[PDB]
Symmetry: C3
Subunit: 197 residues, 3 copies
């Protein structure tokens, strides 16, 4: 059953993702778990902030950040182009397994269900939902999430795309500078029709 | 694993569903994927509009449309009574497999969890959530979704029912006539306790 | 596949849960289904009210009630400390199987992903979402749901914790005394990274 999961592992020691291009290094831990579920992938995702600049986004009224995930034709993460810098792997306890995936193409968003560059079908490339930031006062602050699958390639090397955008546009920021600690999002689970191996 | 999915296939060429009774033919593509997940079915559903009359619903402030899915005692779609006119089948790549289902009863909503004609238990027959229409300005327009399982049969032939209602009641329509194109809903995933085979 | 589910069974005859400490006995049926899905558990939960005092909560503007689920190191329900008084079991038709679980540890919330007593990681212990009460006028009344995993133990015996809180804080109650019947919540499905066996 371990091969039915493609994931980041649980709570890596170091930030594995540069979600802001304004950062000088990886600025958060992107926790991403993809599970093969029949014709679908169950996708489970959140961020644990690390860098101060990312963590202090909780003091802003308007925020938008995107984890751009690009994969080659074999379903392997293109780390040089992607926000996530650590390739995914199968489940091994609470950690990533060692070597070499590629039933991985089977975890990718279907190019039949989610096309590239098709303006007449562009609405089909989008998934939306809500996750939450737990504020210092323990209230659940709603964060809008938008997932775009495929749709726009960077180059001929990028055969699959998963772009996950967290955003909010509220009357007030969830924190002030004196109350802000770590930007963590609650797990968001979404589903998509998967490519075949 | 292909037999664990019962679905419509991906993006059929022609509309497979008459979701408005006001239409003169099938007016949209109902994409429906049911996956057996332990004691539950994971149900994944959305519509891709085809007919102009259905697509132009995006210019209305108040809209309601329901995909009524009726199945016989073996879990086979009663196409003559249902909004969906194309029987479901197992996964074969991105398409439907050929012949003959019926581990299909195992994909049906449980008559023990979701009874028929039981007013004292009627609240148990309902699932709710939210999906989204991607407007021409790329904003996510929230659409209310209500699923009623079993509860009300058409006749003695209809052993199982899945009624999926999309609706919105807003201060403004998501589109004007000059901006409206295709009514597509983002995938909605819901869960229910499944009947046994 | 029956062993991949840990659940309460469907619609037990008697209330199996004391969700209000103000009740004189079990006051509702907690329907809980946990399904192993790759590295995750798919958790499916709702309540069917039984006692009048619980059912009449629908006449209040502000309500909060929590199902506290505590498990020992083997993943078995500590009924003496928990809101749920009926141990979970595997799937057997629409009912619970007989004897003895414990691939059950594998259904528990990961202590690596969801730590105990770690203030610096506390935001990671929370999941949120929305479910709905179907009011007498058939409108869907939104109920806020908050799940806290692990985080706070009662004693050294409680190795795992799932605390599920339903709440609402609205301008008006969903019912009046003359219209109120049964407090039923629509199924809420959430996901978490699971402990290994």
């Amino acid at each position: 059953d371990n091969i039915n999961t493609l994931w980041t592992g649980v709570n890596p020691t170091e930030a594995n993702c540069q979600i802001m291009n304004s950062s000088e290094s990886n600025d958060c831990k992107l926790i991403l778990t993809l599970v093969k579920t029949g014709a679908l992938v169950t996708a489970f995702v959140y961020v644990i902030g690390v860098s101060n600049n990312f963590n202090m986004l909780t003091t802003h009224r308007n925020i938008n950040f995107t984890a751009e995930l690009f994969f080659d034709s074999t379903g392997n993460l293109l780390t040089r182009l992607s926000s996530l810098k650590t390739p995914l792997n199968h489940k091994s306890g609470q950690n990533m397994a060692t070597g070499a995936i590629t039933n991985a193409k089977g975890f990718m968003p279907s190019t039949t269900a989610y096309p590239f560059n098709d303006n007449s079908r562009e609405k089909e490339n989008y998934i939306y939902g809500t996750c939450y930031y737990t504020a210092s006062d323990r209230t659940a602050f709603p964060i809008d999430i938008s997932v775009m699958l495929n749709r726009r390639a960077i180059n001929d090397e990028t055969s699959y795309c998963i772009r996950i955008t967290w955003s909010w546009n509220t009357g007030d920021a969830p924190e002030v500078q004196t109350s802000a600690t770590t930007l963590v999002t609650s797990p968001f689970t979404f589903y998509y029709i998967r490519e075949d191996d």
